[PDB]
Design a binder for this molecule. Structure first.
Ligand SMILES: Cc1ccnc2c1NC(=O)c1cccnc1N2C1CC1
Ligand SMILES: [Ca+2]
Lengths: 412, 555
RNA sequence: CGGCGCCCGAAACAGGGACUG
DNA sequence: CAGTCCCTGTTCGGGCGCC
């Protein structure tokens, strides 16, 4: 018996009608045991064929957790509620959250089930629990309360949240708190000991206000940027000078002051790839002068809030992956490298799933926005397995790309 | 007052729209005199009504005919009402595959009579139903009425039936955790591991529960008829099989024959192992008429032969035993065709299938296997809800070499080796580093956009040159073409410098087969070499003998 | 007429390369 | 800066097979 903030699909578009993808018996079980319980609690309740809307759902275990979390893919709804969240209520992004020596991510999504949801909107939370082999038809529900993972839910709960938090924020003014969907990012420069204590401390503030919380730590001050680097060579084979020249030629789309002229001239005749040609000083100095232009920043690269972020990931082999975040080509906001992620040396799809998450996470701590991925994978492979390795409560946007490697040169 | 059977399902109209008024369209003149009476039947049973002022509604009739009836079946067309009616979430997501059913001791089928007419239409929507169709021919202008139930040919009927039916069964199931029901249309199939007679206890005890909601189930029903014939299948509680296949022996082959043909082989492929469609499928390329005349090649018939002998003997599938693991084994049938069997106990199969689909202009066996393994995982998750243990014709070292080199993210789940030639191999590898003491062929090609004319050639560190004129070509083919030369004219180890990002993208993915004869030849040369290092440089940077081979061919 | 599987086509869509002064 | 082509892959459309 409290008010309910009405919600509307931005003009012209209908509710999400998207199909439920097949689930494992494992996961279908977890949803059944999860939904019957959420029904008993009147969080969701059964629905009929008069409601022709569907959003996909599946289940996950969070990292280092043996407990099953339900997950709805509200991506399509969030696109169709979008004007509502972006234009109506803004959430200021702390530029310092990224500078903190430690940042913990707490899962607060459960609190959202407190607030009721506007009855006219509920027909848009429809999701099917599928059956193995189509033996039964689907068990269909819709959300009565604020659904986890919808973009309106953290918005409408914005007010209620800011309330419960003000004591801690007031008592601890030096601690930074951000909220992105079902997740709460909390970070501080306190030594981890007093930090972990302050997080438990933060846990009570919401624990006693009626919330549950199923390590979480990040270390943003330590986040490194992978700069472009030309190899260190004693003696150069023709092939070396060439791979070098080509790479430099690529880099110059990014850094315009690059010149290949004297390094280029070194290759003049028709010579064996493996013959060793010595570096003239005039080129040797141009190359080293090039190595310089490559420790710098790039004129006019800055984050622009209105534009979407784009992330490109490359498989470098032997467990390594490189990525780049940018909103416009060749103007990169961050570049990096990953190695020895889970699955390294055994499962590429696992590693990339891991990769997409680590990238999405930094993307949220830094600009407070999830990127759109260009995934180096065939559609169906990713689409078939990505759901097994997924440990996150959000779902970034992605498209599939194939590039035979000339862009691999991000890493030696 | 009429009476009230079972819970009603709210139905709206696409906002800002209202019921139809329509003129009739042709239907046969004979069968239509019977309903003039039949409508009068329904008034009393509760399936019809009427009101004078309130209906601005009229609807026509258009039909489709059916074989195998001992009585004729009436119909009405709401098509105008349909398009104006809200959409529903369809209840039939497709049908279960036989191989996914768990084995059940007892299995019966009850057929629901008055199935569509046993379901109440929504009170407030009833109005939109009013309709008229010719008496015998016709005489005086007419009369009209409204529908109290689910109308034949209405958009919401199957959906609302299906959902309602489900709602009814729900309380029975909870009181009977170990019974198993499945609903297809108006037929229910029930089954149990209970003892044979006590199972029949619950069959009546359920016909009770259905009637209690007004759902009629006669005893012409058969427990003794199984196998039941449902959608091409024959189902016995212990084992299943496809319904009998008729292979055309026709001497005259038109492209529509081969089509009907293929679909049958492919449909056969779920159970009979080793069906191959490749060569029969070649005929279909770039044909104008489905009625066109096409000949059978020797290959396609030799295959069709091998295929005909597989169908000779009968075969049956088993059911799934959740206690035991799933096993999937793939054999390479060559020409990018694959067959697989999925079983649990050895030599007793749940199902079979083929994967023949050739994906991309240039590909290889590792890729194609990877694809099949993926087709199979998906099919397995749909059907058993788990991924099989894979048995594969590929050395764990073959595979490790591919996926770890390939630029794409790629994976096969937990899987083991089966040594069952042909074994899958990689036919060549490119060196990762320059080859000492190999000739270095610098290659380029160029063609002219207007004349479609060009030349492909090379220069080497040894002084050896070549330029070949080529007609009716493209800029790309000359770049492929120069590499081809450089392979031919080189020894067993060779380095090649190309400036074609295009050419490089292809060769580096180590294709073993191509649509393009030129790539096939490159491949064939590639397999013969001992060591090949293929490198790329930017064009027109004044590089190497790259500038030199550029002058030779752009000239 | 819809669902699933499939075979083909590319009339179309998208991505990337290359030339045109 | 825009407009020609060349090449490849992914939507879609056709038409079978099972309803
Ligand atoms: C046609 C059909 C479709 C889906 N499931 C079943 C059936 N009918 C059966 O013949 C059947 C056979 C064996 C085991 N389950 C069966 N059943 C389940 C109900 C016990
Ligand atoms: Ca050239």
């Amino acid at each position: 018996p409290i008010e309910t903030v009405p919600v509307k699909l931005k003009p012209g578009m209908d509710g999400p009608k998207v199909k439920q993808w097949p689930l494992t018996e494992e996961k279908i079980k977890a949803l059944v045991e999860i939904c019957t319980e959420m029904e008993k609690e009147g969080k969701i309740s059964k629905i009929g064929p008069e409601n022709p809307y569907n959003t996909p759902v599946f289940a996950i275990k969070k990292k280092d957790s043996t407990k099953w979390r339900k997950l709805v893919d509200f991506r399509e709804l969030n696109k169709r509620t979008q004007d509502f969240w972006e234009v109506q209520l803004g959430i200021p992004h702390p530029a310092g959250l990224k500078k903190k020596k430690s940042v913990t991510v707490l899962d607060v999504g459960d609190a959202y089930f407190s607030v009721p949801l506007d009855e006219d909107f509920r027909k848009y939370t429809a999701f099917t629990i599928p059956s193995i082999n189509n033996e039964t038809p689907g068990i269909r529900y819709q959300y009565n309360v604020l659904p986890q993972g919808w973009k309106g839910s953290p918005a409408i709960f914005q007010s209620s949240m800011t309330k419960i938090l003000e004591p801690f924020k007031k008592q601890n003014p030096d601690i930074v708190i951000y909220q992105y969907m079902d997740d709460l990012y909390v970070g501080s420069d306190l030594e981890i000991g007093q930090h972990r204590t302050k997080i438990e401390e933060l846990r009570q503030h919401l624990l006693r206000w009626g919330l549950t919380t199923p390590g979480y730590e990040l270390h943003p001050d330590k986040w490194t940027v992978q700069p472009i680097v030309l190899p260190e060579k004693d003696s150069w084979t023709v092939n070396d000078i060439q791979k070098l020249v080509g790479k430099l030629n690529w880099a110059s789309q990014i850094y315009p002051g690059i010149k290949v002229r004297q390094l280029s001239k070194l290759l003049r005749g028709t010579k064996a790839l493996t013959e060793v040609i010595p570096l003239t000083e005039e080129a040797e100095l141009e190359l080293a002068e090039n190595r310089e232009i490559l420790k710098e920043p790039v004129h006019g690269v800055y984050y622009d809030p209105s534009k979407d972020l784009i992330a490109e990931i490359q498989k470098q082999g032997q467990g390594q992956w490189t990525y780049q975040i940018y909103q416009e080509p060749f103007k990169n906001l961050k570049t990096g490298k990953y190695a020895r992620m889970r699955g390294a040396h055994t499962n590429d799809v696992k590693q990339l799933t891991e990769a997409v998450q680590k990238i999405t996470t930094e993307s949220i701590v830094i600009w407070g926005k999830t990127p759109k991925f260009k995934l180096p994978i065939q559609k169906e492979t990713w689409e078939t397995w990505w759901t097994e390795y997924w440990q996150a409560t959000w779902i970034p946007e992605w498209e599939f790309v194939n590039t035979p490697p000339l862009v691999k040169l991000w890493y030696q | 007052v009429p009476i009230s059977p079972i819970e009603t399902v709210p139905v709206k109209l696409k906002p800002g729209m209202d019921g139809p008024k329509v003129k009739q369209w042709p239907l046969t003149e004979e069968k239509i005199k019977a309903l003039v009476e039949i409508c009068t039947e329904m008034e009393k049973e509760g399936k019809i009504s009427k009101i004078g002022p309130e209906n601005p509604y009229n609807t026509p009739v258009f039909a489709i005919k059916k074989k195998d009836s001992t009585k004729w079946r009436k119909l009405v067309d709401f098509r105008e009402l349909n398009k104006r009616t809200q959409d529903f979430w369809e209840v039939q997501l497709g049908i279960p595959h036989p191989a996914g059913l768990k084995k059940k001791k007892s299995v019966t089928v009850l057929d629901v009579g008055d199935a569509y007419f046993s379901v109440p239409l929504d009170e407030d929507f009833r109005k939109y139903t009013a309709f008229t169709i010719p008496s015998i021919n016709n005489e005086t202008p007419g009369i009209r009425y409204q529908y109290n139930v689910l109308p034949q040919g209405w958009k919401g009927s199957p959906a609302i039936f299906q959902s309602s039916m489900t709602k009814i069964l729900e309380p029975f199931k909870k009181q009977n955790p170990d019974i198993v029901i499945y609903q297809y249309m108006d037929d229910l199939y029930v089954g149990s591991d209970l003892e044979i007679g006590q199972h029949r206890t619950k069959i009546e005890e359920l016909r009770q529960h259905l009637l209690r909601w007004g759902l009629t189930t006669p005893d012409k029903k058969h427990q003794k008829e199984p196998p039941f014939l449902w959608m091409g299948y024959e189902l016995h509680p212990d084992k299943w099989t496809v319904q009998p296949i008729v292979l055309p022996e026709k001497d005259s082959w038109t492209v529509n024959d081969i089509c009907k043909l293929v679909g049958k082989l492919n449909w056969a492929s779920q159970i009979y192992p080793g069906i191959k469609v490749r060569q029969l499928s070649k005929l279909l390329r770039g044909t104008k008429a489905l009625t066109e005349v096409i000949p059978l090649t020797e290959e396609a018939e030799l295959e069709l032969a091998e295929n005909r002998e597989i169908l000779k003997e009968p075969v049956h599938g088993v059911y799934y035993d959740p206690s035991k693991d799933l096993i999937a084994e793939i054999q390479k049938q060559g020409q990018g065709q694959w067959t697989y069997q999925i079983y649990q106990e050895p030599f007793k199969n749940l199902k079979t299938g083929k994967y023949a689909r050739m994906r991309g202009a240039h590909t290889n066996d590792v890729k194609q296997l990877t694809e099949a393994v993926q087709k199979i995982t998906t099919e397995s998750i749909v059907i058993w809800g788990k991924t099989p243990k894979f048995k594969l014709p590929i050395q764990k070292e073959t595979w490790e070499t591919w996926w770890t080199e390939y630029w794409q993210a790629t994976w096969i789940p937990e899987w083991e080796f089966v040594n069952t030639p042909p074994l899958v191999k990689l036919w060549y590898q490119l060196e990762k580093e320059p080859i000492v003491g190999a000739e270095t062929f610098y290659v380029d090609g160029a063609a002219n956009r207007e004349t479609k004319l060009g030349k492909a050639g090379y220069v080497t560190n040894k002084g050896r040159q070549k330029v070949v004129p080529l007609t009716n070509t493209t800029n790309q083919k000359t770049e492929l073409q120069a590499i081809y030369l450089a392979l031919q004219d080189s020894g067993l180890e060779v380095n090649i410098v190309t400036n074609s990002q295009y050419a490089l993208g292809i060769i580096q993915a180590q294709p073993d087969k191509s649509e393009s004869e030129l790539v096939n030849q490159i491949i064939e040369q590639l397999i013969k070499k001992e060591k090949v290092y293929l490198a790329w440089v930017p064009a027109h940077k004044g590089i190497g003998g790259n500038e030199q081979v550029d002058k030779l061919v752009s000239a």
